[PDB]
DNA sequence: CTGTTGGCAAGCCAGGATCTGAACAATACCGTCATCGAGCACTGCACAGA
């Protein structure tokens, strides 16, 4: 569960070794963090999936509250309130709503990691120029970050695949902080311009399936439905166990 | 064996005009994204029975 388990990748903004911190650790302390990832693109994938994270489970009430928490860390306590009613969407492995994913997906076989690997595959050069076996085995940190990435950032896998809500690659540009806990606080807006700015389906797509070639008018679209929207129909198979993520 | 020297080298004036210098037609195409499942091929597989 991307609310309760570690999964998140940091190592401190001036430190040294990574380590995988949980989505309360990062909300409880004056630890200062800076995201760690091989990639660019993941790093920022990953914010903006903490982003939209904590746009759902705590938008500040005022300007006030917002600058606070800013400065200030929530306690334990404050944190588990907030987070208490959307554990439920959160499950990568999950019965009936698996996070970002549809289950009941007929296909003959099965896809490798690497397609959602965002430029490792995708043009026929791909297999010449880049290193092999980048999408082996993910951890699960990295295959959510994948995922999201593919529903924000990158084009769809081919024909019959839809892009995300922007469209195809559009430029994501997030406000800049010091650490990550406050980058992450400084790009949630508050509850009056949440309001302001979306003036409806509230509930996700692996929650509230998409109809197949119904037509959306874009104003009947949640926000939390539109900031975790899934284009694709995707579904994770059964992980492995121990070793190196690759 | 022995072969020279001085003194001197110009000035005037004059070089053109006419009129003319192009047009047409034509400049390419292919491949270097991907997806899914189906319909339809090499291609070995032993055999059973010929």
């Given at each position: 569960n991307l609310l309760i388990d570690n999964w998140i990748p940091v190592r401190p903004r001036n430190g040294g070794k990574v380590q995988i911190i949980n989505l309360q650790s990062l909300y409880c302390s004056r630890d200062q963090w800076r995201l760690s990832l091989p990639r660019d693109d993941m790093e920022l994938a990953a914010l903006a999936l903490l982003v939209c994270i904590g746009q759902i489970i705590a938008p500040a009430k005022d300007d006030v509250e917002f600058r606070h928490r800013i400065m200030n860390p929530l306690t334990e306590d404050e944190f588990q309130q907030l987070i208490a009613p959307w554990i439920?969407?959160?499950?990568?492995?999950?019965?009936?709503?698996?996070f970002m994913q549809t289950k009941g997906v007929k296909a003959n076989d099965v896809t490798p990691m690497?397609?959602?690997?965002?430029?490792?595959?995708?043009?026929?050069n791909c297999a010449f120029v880049n290193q092999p076996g980048q999408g082996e085995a993910l951890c699960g940190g990295c295959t959510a970050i994948a995922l999201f990435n593919q529903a924000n950032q990158a084009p769809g896998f081919g024909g019959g695949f839809k892009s995300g809500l922007r469209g195809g690659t559009p430029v994501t540009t997030f406000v800049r902080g010091i650490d990550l806990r406050s980058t992450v606080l400084l790009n949630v807006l508050t509850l009056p311009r949440l309001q302001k700015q979306f003036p409806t389906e509230n509930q996700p797509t692996w929650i509230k399936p998409i109809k197949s070639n119904e037509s959306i008018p874009?104003?009947?679209?949640?926000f939390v439905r539109g900031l975790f929207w899934q284009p694709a129909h995707i579904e994770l198979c059964d992980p492995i166990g121990i070793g190196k993520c690759s």
């Open positions: 439920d969407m959160f499950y990568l492995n999950h019965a009936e709503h698996p690497e397609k959602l690997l965002a430029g490792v595959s995708g043009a026929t874009a104003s009947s679209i949640g």
